[PDB]
Symmetry: D2
């Protein structure tokens, strides 16, 4: 098979950051990535603009420099590739990790392509592969999406967005610009505080001009092939509808985490894996986590700017157990 000192699952920004810092401390690493590096950013909507300036998205002392104040999706793609190039990272792409088992102070990794054995393990699988379940009648119709890519094809289509965070407001602005008839249905009373303060004004101006319908305290009750039905303050309303974007968030793959022996916890920030806040070691010895996997659900506690510092934390602890 293959024997590597350390393996990292996930080549997102926090996984990449983990490999660099371990390499800086002389630990030979291998990143195993289900897609290619930073698939998450690759799957952003085409025109997405980050909300961090780009120095705050940079990892391992390769500067992320762009003329705009905030960088776009494709600039991050070009940046993180250069990071891999510059740090000479060993990346196994298009190889999904399917099973991890610990065996006599060693890990046994089974992927869709090979079998590996390693001493240190780092799970940076993030949360984007598992979208929250909608739970209304019709939530499985193919007209329902949990991801937004481009708005052009929904030109002159009656579209509904369920949810109220940055994904919801981003998609509605883009869909309105492309000629969809957009209805946002949000179950809260007022705009979520996590919508970034320099975006909400562009969205709110359009709802005031009767160009987008914004409904608060709205819960969707039924989705058919050509209608959506929602209730507001008890009152049920039914509107014609061609497509539904369920922008209701994501969550980590807990099945995968449990099957390696990692515990769920429920504490200050919700259901999170068990880990040593000071070193990021989990209950399974020599198994670390990095990235938004450490936060759990609340997609506003850990992003790239804080998550990229895990790797350095992991490196100190991994180097320490080298007596």
């Amino acid at each position: 098979m293959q024997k590597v000192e350390s393996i990292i699952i996930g080549g997102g920004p926090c996984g990449l950051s983990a490999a660099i810092e371990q390499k800086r401390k002389g630990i030979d690493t291998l990143i195993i990535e289900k897609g290619n590096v930073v698939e998450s950013i690759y799957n952003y909507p085409t025109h997405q603009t980050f909300f961090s300036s780009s120095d705050k998205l940079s990892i391992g002392d390769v500067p992320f420099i762009v003329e705009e104040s905030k960088p776009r999706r494709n600039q991050a793609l070009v940046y993180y590739r250069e990071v891999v190039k510059h740090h000479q990272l060993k990346v196994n792409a298009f190889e999904e990790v399917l099973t991890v088992k610990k065996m006599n102070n060693k890990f046994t990794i089974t992927t869709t392509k090979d079998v590996y054995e390693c001493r240190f393990l780092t799970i940076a699988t993030g949360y984007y592969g598992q979208h929250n379940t909608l739970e209304v009648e019709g939530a499985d119709l193919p007209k329902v999406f949990h991801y937004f890519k481009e708005a052009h094809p929904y030109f002159d289509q009656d579209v509904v967005i369920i949810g109220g965070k940055n994904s919801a407001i981003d998609a509605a602005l883009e869909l309105e610009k492309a000629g969809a008839n957009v209805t946002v249905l949000y179950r809260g009373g007022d705009y979520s505080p996590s919508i970034k303060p320099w975006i909400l004004p562009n969205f709110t101006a359009l709802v005031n001009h009767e160009k987008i319908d914004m409904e608060f305290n709205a819960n969707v009750t039924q989705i058919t092939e050509d209608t959506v039905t929602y209730e507001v303050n008890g009152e049920s309303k039914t509107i014609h509808n061609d497509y539904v974007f369920a922008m209701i968030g994501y969550h980590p793959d807990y099945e995968f985490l449990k099957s390696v022996g990692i515990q769920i916890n429920t504490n200050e920030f919700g259901t999170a894996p068990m880990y040593n806040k000071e070193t990021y070691e989990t209950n399974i010895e020599n198994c670390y986590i990095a990235g938004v996997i450490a936060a759990g659900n609340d997609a506003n506690t850990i992003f790239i700017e804080n998550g990229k510092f895990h790797g350095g934390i992991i490196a100190q602890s991994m180097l320490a157990k080298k007596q």
Copy 2:
């Protein structure tokens, strides 16, 4: 059922132009589009730049104005949508025509959503949905694509491009920029003349700096999941290969075209459908074609710049038959 004077199958640029021009002659028309309007352009590679200046893509008295010299893919999308808004065109999107039958002096159109009855029929389906077949061992593996979209995921992958015209050279530049190891295998003796003269220098410079492998007189003989084997002057070579981009062109849906009763016609121009060069009417009375479909095989006869003129021709002939 549904009764319309005129139906146009295809909401690409040529379909749209045909609708405008018929409407200008007092003909009530309906576009039935399997996707949404200008799906073709919607399915271009993401960062694609047109080779036409943008005055030459403009249709139906809506000026296409951009600050760049040649427009990018997303600008055309914004533009063609506005064309539909301005000209109040009826487009039934996400509705594939499945069957056309002639009965008395009326056509009966069966789609995935309804049945229509019309006097005049205009097939503007273009050729991008039907790719030329590779015809080598391994062409059905999932590592073989006939459409290029974005290059990032092929970062650090060993990629082979089959073909020689603008699709191959566009995709090679984009894949090289994204850090792939690109090998172009072209069955010709020299660069195809139809590659645009302001792109080619960017390709050859990278070729001359040994950044892309370019092979002439090369025919691919086998594709396995991790190799490609091709012949050059009889000599066989086998190189490791992760993905294959078969940029060998596209062709009209001749099955659908025959199933309505239209004759295929062996010309010394490239075997195309039967049509009156002066009116674009087929062998079936009141059934016209417009767009690149009238070119047949070669794709250097009809593009948007001239193909957008069929509409004006067809409208005259339909008006001659009156109503």
Copy 3:
């Protein structure tokens, strides 16, 4: 000399707008523009982003279409030229009007290039060309600018911005992004309400992170070659300083407006010329005004969006007067 029915001083969007609508009524016009068309937009800062969507900046039967939400400076430049091209407008560029006198029912216009005589006259000279006078010691130093263009050359220079409106806040973000040490000195107590609600948060963040110095209740008292001295509620502070941006607003050339015989007003809200409100005719018979020059009495501002509608009103009144 030269004899034209109607003359328009000013080829900004509102001057151009007046010409199109008068021409639509079969009235011959000539635009005399001190620069070339839309010089004002041309003298915007290089990277300036309009605050309107681009349909609200469109004039005269030419759609303003862009893929972004709000268009950039050069997109409007490209656009307003096509408006002139499409409407075949006579424009005499690089010709400043210096002198207007009434004799009979006829005007005699004296420019730096010719002498003109016309029946209808429209003064659409806007306000961007005459900056408010600073009125501090040192305001004549060459280090004092009343216009912002690009920020690069102020890299690692100590810069002061006088003012607190959109010009001041835009210029500060640009200068900070380019590495200047920026101090904004504003004579008010809080952020001006006219700062766009989607821009302010980016500025506010930089102030809170000590990347820009923001001083309220700040009045500048002296500018020397290498210091700036200001008072904050009376206490004097003096800082090292390399350049000064007095973004303290603009005003129409009222000198020119009186020198033809038009009364100003100065009343409560502001200070504007006399005009009929229903025709936009001034106290001088057959003398109209258009554009932001008409702002001042009314408790509203005039941007391109509402100001461009003057032209239509003007055309009717000129159409009533026949001739």
Copy 4:
């Protein structure tokens, strides 16, 4: 009155490269830049696109990374500012060096702000600040420019471009897209080979579609207030003309080079300073040159790509001379 070990005159890319390389070897450096860093690039036409990929513009191990194939002008500005920050280079901006004289183990440098005294001097003044003399009647009219910035204000004006290299060809394209009536007058027989091969096809298409006038073997004889008169193989022609773009090249400031005591000496290829090819030291001990100024006699061209390597070679010779 101020004392530094080494001084570099010129803060363009090759000067900056010199400072980094000297700093890597422990030499105290100071850049004196008449403008701010990379003023030459700052004075490019607003929309200039480099012809180098951006890897080749990188200096001192700060990677220049951009999503597009060739970088634009403002990206080069953003990058070179980040190099100065990243290495912490001392740059005294807006301080023109007027005089250098040799005295003892020291140079005495006179600028418009101070006097310096140093051991090592590196003159990296480039050529973009000194335009070749036009030397025809009218070359001093204000309608004659030796620098191109933006094309919009020349909308619908009669423009003449003198020259035949990329500056002329770039300017013609930018001036044609903005609606000028462009006549390029070149004293040569055919297109200059130095025009980049992916740009020439865009100009040629415009010449062939009679939208730009291109005249070969044309020499300009007179510039009047509103005409230009040129001879083509002796035949005289006179055309109406509003502005003149003398894109006839540039040259290093050779007086300044002589006034320090460095010998210039012309050949084939041109005139260059006298210097050792292995150390880049001039005839004056401890006075080096860097950048395109070293071009002239070598029959080789010096761009940012090759010119940026002087600094390292110069650092060796300076370090060899020890302390």
